[PDB]
Amino acid sequence: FLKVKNWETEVVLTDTLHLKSTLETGCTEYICMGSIMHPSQHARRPEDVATKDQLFPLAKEFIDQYYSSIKRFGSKAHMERLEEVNKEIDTTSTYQLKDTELIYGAKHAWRNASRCVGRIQWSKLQVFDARDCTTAHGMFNYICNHVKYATNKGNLRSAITIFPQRTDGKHDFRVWNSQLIRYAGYKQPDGSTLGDPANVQFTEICIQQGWKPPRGRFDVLPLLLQANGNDPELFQIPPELVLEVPIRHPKFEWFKDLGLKWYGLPAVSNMLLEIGGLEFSACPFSGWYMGTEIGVRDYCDNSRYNILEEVAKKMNLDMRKTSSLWKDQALVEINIAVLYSFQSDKVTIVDHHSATESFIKHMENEYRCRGGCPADWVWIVPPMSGSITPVFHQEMLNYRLTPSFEYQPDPWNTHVWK
Amino acid sequence: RFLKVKNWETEVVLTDTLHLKSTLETGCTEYICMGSIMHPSDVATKDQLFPLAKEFIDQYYSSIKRFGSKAHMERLEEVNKEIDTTSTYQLKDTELIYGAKHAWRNASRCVGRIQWSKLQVFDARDCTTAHGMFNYICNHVKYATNKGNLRSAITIFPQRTDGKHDFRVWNSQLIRYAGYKQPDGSTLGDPANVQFTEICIQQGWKPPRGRFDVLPLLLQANGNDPELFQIPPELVLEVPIRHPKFEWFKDLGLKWYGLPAVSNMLLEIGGLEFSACPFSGWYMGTEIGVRDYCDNSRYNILEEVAKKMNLDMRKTSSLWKDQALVEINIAVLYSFQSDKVTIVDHHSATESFIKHMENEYRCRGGCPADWVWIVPPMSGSITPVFHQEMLNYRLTPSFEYQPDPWNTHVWKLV
Ligand code: HEM
Ligand code: HEM
Ligand SMILES: Cc1cc(N)nc(COc2cc(CCN3CCC3)cc(F)c2F)c1
Ligand SMILES: Cc1cc(N)nc(COc2cc(CCN3CCC3)cc(F)c2F)c1
Numbered sequence: 148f149l150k151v152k153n154w155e156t157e158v159v160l161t162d163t164l165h166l167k168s169t170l171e172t173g174c175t176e177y178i179c180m181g182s183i184m185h186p187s188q189h190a191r192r193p194e195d196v197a198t199k200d201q202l203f204p205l206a207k208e209f210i211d212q213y214y215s216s217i218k219r220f221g222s223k224a225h226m227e228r229l230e231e232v233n234k235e236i237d238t239t240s241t242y243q244l245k246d247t248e249l250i251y252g253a254k255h256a257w258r259n260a261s262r263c264v265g266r267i268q269w270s271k272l273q274v275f276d277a278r279d280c281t282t283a284h285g286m287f288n289y290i291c292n293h294v295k296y297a298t299n300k301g302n303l304r305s306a307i308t309i310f311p312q313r314t315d316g317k318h319d320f321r322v323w324n325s326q327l328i329r330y331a332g333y334k335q336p337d338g339s340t341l342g343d344p345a346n347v348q349f350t351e352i353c354i355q356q357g358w359k360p361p362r363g364r365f366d367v368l369p370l371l372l373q374a375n376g377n378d379p380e381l382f383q384i385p386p387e388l389v390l391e392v393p394i395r396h397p398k399f400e401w402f403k404d405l406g407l408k409w410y411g412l413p414a415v416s417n418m419l420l421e422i423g424g425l426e427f428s429a430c431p432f433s434g435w436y437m438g439t440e441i442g443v444r445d446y447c448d449n450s451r452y453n454i455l456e457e458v459a460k461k462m463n464l465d466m467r468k469t470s471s472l473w474k475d476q477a478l479v480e481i482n483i484a485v486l487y488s489f490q491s492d493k494v495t496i497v498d499h500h501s502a503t504e505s506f507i508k509h510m511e512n513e514y515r516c517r518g519g520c521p522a523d524w525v526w527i528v529p530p531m532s533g534s535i536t537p538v539f540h541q542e543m544l545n546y547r548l549t550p551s552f553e554y555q556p557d558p559w560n561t562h563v564w565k
Numbered sequence: 566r567f568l569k570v571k572n573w574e575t576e577v578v579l580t581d582t583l584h585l586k587s588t589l590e591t592g593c594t595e596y597i598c599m600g601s602i603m604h605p606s607d608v609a610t611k612d613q614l615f616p617l618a619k620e621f622i623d624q625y626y627s628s629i630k631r632f633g634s635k636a637h638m639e640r641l642e643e644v645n646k647e648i649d650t651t652s653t654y655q656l657k658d659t660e661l662i663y664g665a666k667h668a669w670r671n672a673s674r675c676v677g678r679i680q681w682s683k684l685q686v687f688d689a690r691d692c693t694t695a696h697g698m699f700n701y702i703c704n705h706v707k708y709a710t711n712k713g714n715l716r717s718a719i720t721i722f723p724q725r726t727d728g729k730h731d732f733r734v735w736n737s738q739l740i741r742y743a744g745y746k747q748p749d750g751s752t753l754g755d756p757a758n759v760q761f762t763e764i765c766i767q768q769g770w771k772p773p774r775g776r777f778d779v780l781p782l783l784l785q786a787n788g789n790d791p792e793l794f795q796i797p798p799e800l801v802l803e804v805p806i807r808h809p810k811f812e813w814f815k816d817l818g819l820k821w822y823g824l825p826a827v828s829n830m831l832l833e834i835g836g837l838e839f840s841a842c843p844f845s846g847w848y849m850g851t852e853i854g855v856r857d858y859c860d861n862s863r864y865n866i867l868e869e870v871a872k873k874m875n876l877d878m879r880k881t882s883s884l885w886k887d888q889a890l891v892e893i894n895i896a897v898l899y900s901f902q903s904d905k906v907t908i909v910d911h912h913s914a915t916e917s918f919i920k921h922m923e924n925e926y927r928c929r930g931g932c933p934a935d936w937v938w939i940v941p942p943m944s945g946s947i948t949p950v951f952h953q954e955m956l957n958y959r960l961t962p963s964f965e966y967q968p969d970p971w972n973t974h975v976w977k978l979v
């Protein structure tokens with residue numbers, strides 16, 4: 148048993164679910180790595196083609212978990228499924244997931260995402276099976292439908308599209324973009340940077356691949372899609388499918404003159420979904436923004452848009468010294484604007500108050516119906532107004548459950564070109 | 566073996582070798598992280614205390630480039646003599662200053678450690694009575710306050726012997742405000758201290774029952790019953806809170822004390838336990854303006870400030886809470902700065918901690934840090950420590966938590 152306490156309410160939860168974790172956190176009883184971005188490399192199999200005594204134990208575990216999930220442990224379906232996975236592994240060195248299994252696993256990878264504040268919705272995910280895909284064109288078709296379905300004219304809906312799992316390791320399916328919709332980043336001759344500095348490298352690869360950049364500040368980047376190991380290919384997302392929100396302020400009417408807008412759909416496309424030892428290297432998933440993600444990190448990180456400068460200038464704030472708190476004051480107004488713009492354009496968005504409050508309820512639900520809920524306090528607490536949100540005062544146990552979403556190398560570091 | 570932390574804003578990479586020198590547990594396991602548990606994981610026998618003393622003396626004589634020296638070996642032999650004869654030992658005045666400064670340096674949760682080497686150590690191990698402690702603590706306060714030009718200081722009382730003669734400051738801080746619950750359920754003063762306020766009142770304290778009553782010192786010497794003493798009001802430096810733009814802010818009637826002085830911790834050096842060691846420095850703005858005034862369990866003046874700010878308080882997404890919080894923290898910094906009372910804003914504080922950290926990696930081989938505590942409780946990502954990876958491990962000497970004395974003390978009078 149392991150108890151967590153909330154210090155605003157004295158609610159104590161008891162955690163047993165953590166007993167079912169397998170992967171090292173990176174911590175030891177002598178050092179805590181809770182603030183390391185990538186604390187561990189304990190993966191469940193060797194990098195590529197696994198042997199039978201390697202793959203099957205994980206497969207047996209997942210199927211066991213899935214059938215245990217639906218009250219059918221040891222049933223005919225369960226015991227045949229096992230024999231079915233054995234022969235597949237024997238005869239193909241891999242195995243294929245049933246549709247139900249794939250959906251269970253996608254959902255429980257989100258459910259186990261200890262960094263995600265949005266998980267109260269984990270059961271409501273739409274899974275798009277794209278395992279039949281064979282080309283970057285087909286990849287591009289699956290993604291456009293994902294984008295269109297998920298955007299739903301602003302009434303955003305969470306979805307994941309799952310492309311063929313990794314086989315030998317070279318025949319990887321990869322979305323080279325980090326998100327499906329990101330703005331481009333242009334290294335300027337005068338040292339500075341136009342657009343999104345996070346994407347300078349990726350923007351240059353696109354240019355290097357033949358992308359003709361319109362060299363603005365909010366240039367939607369092409370899709371760079373790689374299928375069964377081949378060279379990636381540029382596809383331009385139909386603009387009518389990329390919903391965008393112009394940022395304006397409900398009070399400062401000069402705020403719209405800053406010319407800012409952000410895209411409506413956050414869709415993480417460079418991560419790896421892992422289920423029963425299988426590895427889906429292309430699984431773009433999407434939901435809706437927490438407003439701080441755009442207004443705190445995307446606009447106000449130093450290595451990002453860094454618009455605190457401008458916003459505070461137009462607000463007439465003493466930017467001489469830090470003690471005036473001019474960054475804080477502009478930061479709030481930016482995030483107020485971002486929220487008011489998305490809500491005015493009927494585009495789904497949630498503020499950090501609602502979301503954190505939502506996540507407290509999710510934890511409660513999880514400790515009652517599951518015996519625990521893995522949460523990463525460093526990532527749940529929003530990057531502004533930490534202590535006025537309920538999660539700041541909530542103790543959290545962090546631990547690694549499978550299925551999960553894993554990081555993976557940026558493909559251009561590892562891809563032998565053709 | 567080495568370990569690397571990265572700053573994701575600057576891409577600076579530091580190599581922690583110091584984490585090897587730790588041997589106290591964090592509470593994390595290999596398969597579970599407890600990094601956000603507030604408190605994770607009678608006294609030392611002879612055999613327990615020998616190596617702890619040995620490790621500390623060894624580390625002391627290393628620090629001063631005297632390891633293996635004649636004085637190093639004689640000191641070791643001297644410490645063993647005492648632990649045999651008396652089942653404990655006594656630190657030298659150098660050792661006490663060195664251990665107290667290093668327990669601060671080793672405090673992973675403190676963002677203010679760039680100052681650790683300028684700690685003023687007051688040795689109070691001759692104290693025998695609560696009156697003696699009042700005297701010592703008053704002198705601490707007068708020295709640390711320095712007419713608003715604050716100075717860092719710890720006052721260290723006799724260590725623990727058998728656990729039945731502990732010195733303890735029952736106050737959590739040396740200056741705090743009282744909290745009184747009302748019949749109607751509301752709270753006058755500081756709701757954090759309601760319990761300790763009741764303990765005082767019960768002990769005979771005649772309370773003013775105002776919003777900012779400085780609490781009495783509840784002092785325990787040699788395991789006797791604690792005793793009440795009123796800090797002389799002229800040694801309590803206070804700052805009336807006003808706002809540089811909102812003339813109406815002074816009408817909130819708010820004030821805070823200028824001297825942060827934590828008194829309920831235990832100082833541990835070489836296996837010795839100093840159960841009473843109040844220490845003080847100066848405030849970071851957010852500790853008063855974010856947590857003291859705006860936690861729902863505390864003064865909860867977001868409510869009022871937003872109202873007078875004419876904010877839309879219906880929907881959260883108006884961020885009225887965020888917007889008012891910023892203004893309360895502007896008011897706090899401007900008030901202190903105006904009254905020339907020392908205060909550091911959270912940007913300057915986090916900046917200095919990154920500098921400190923990198924310096925500690927250069928010369929010491931690492932610097933344990935509790936990201937969950939280092940990040941200020943507001944505007945997290947726009948400070949450099951948010952993007953700073955940090956390794957957390959437990960070095961000794963350290964400051965440690967201990968039970969509240971009214972949970973464990975057994976009484977004497979009547
Ligand atoms: C529906 C609304 C959602 C919201 C508001 C939300 C919010 C967040 C936030 C704020 C983070 C912190 C990362 C950052 O700040 O950049 C995060 C992380 C994450 N989210 Fe969610 N999320 C949502 C949906 C989803 C969905 C649909 C999935 C997958 C199916 C998902 C998977 C993840 C993962 C895997 C991580 C972090 C993984 C890691 O870094 O180890 N989220 N989320
Ligand atoms: C000189 C200026 C100082 C500043 C600005 C400062 C600031 C802080 C802050 C903001 C915290 C976080 C705690 C909270 O917010 O509740 C903290 C924790 C702490 N500080 Fe410092 N501090 C200072 C001096 C000192 C001194 C002089 C000592 C001891 C001699 C010390 C030891 C500690 C300890 C032990 C903790 C908490 C560790 C724990 O609770 O486990 N600090 N400090
Ligand atoms: C689906 C979804 C909805 C939503 N609203 N937000 C998110 C955030 O997704 C993620 C963001 C990051 C960024 C990490 N930072 C950049 C360098 C550090 C990493 C991940 F692994 C994520 F999964 C996802
Ligand atoms: C000397 C000094 C200067 C300064 N500016 N701030 C501090 C705050 O340090 C501390 C803060 C807390 C908060 C604990 N809360 C009760 C549950 C959470 C506990 C401690 F033990 C500290 F030491 C100390």
Ligand SMILES: C[C@H](O)[C@H](O)[C@H]1CNc2nc(N)[nH]c(=O)c2N1
Nearest residue numbers: 539540541542601602603937938
């Ligand atoms: C639950 C969580 O561990 C707790 O609220 C912590 C978080 N970080 C903190 N950080 C500081 N500086 N002070 C605190 O009291 C806390 N409390």
Ligand SMILES: C[C@H](O)[C@H](O)[C@H]1CNc2nc(N)[nH]c(=O)c2N1
Nearest residue numbers: 182183184525526951952953954
């Ligand atoms: C060093 C630190 O772990 C790193 O910057 C983390 C901190 N917390 C975060 N929290 C969220 N939500 N997103 C992030 O990218 C990060 N970055």
Ligand SMILES: [Zn+2]
Nearest residue numbers: 174179593598
């Ligand atoms: Zn840990």
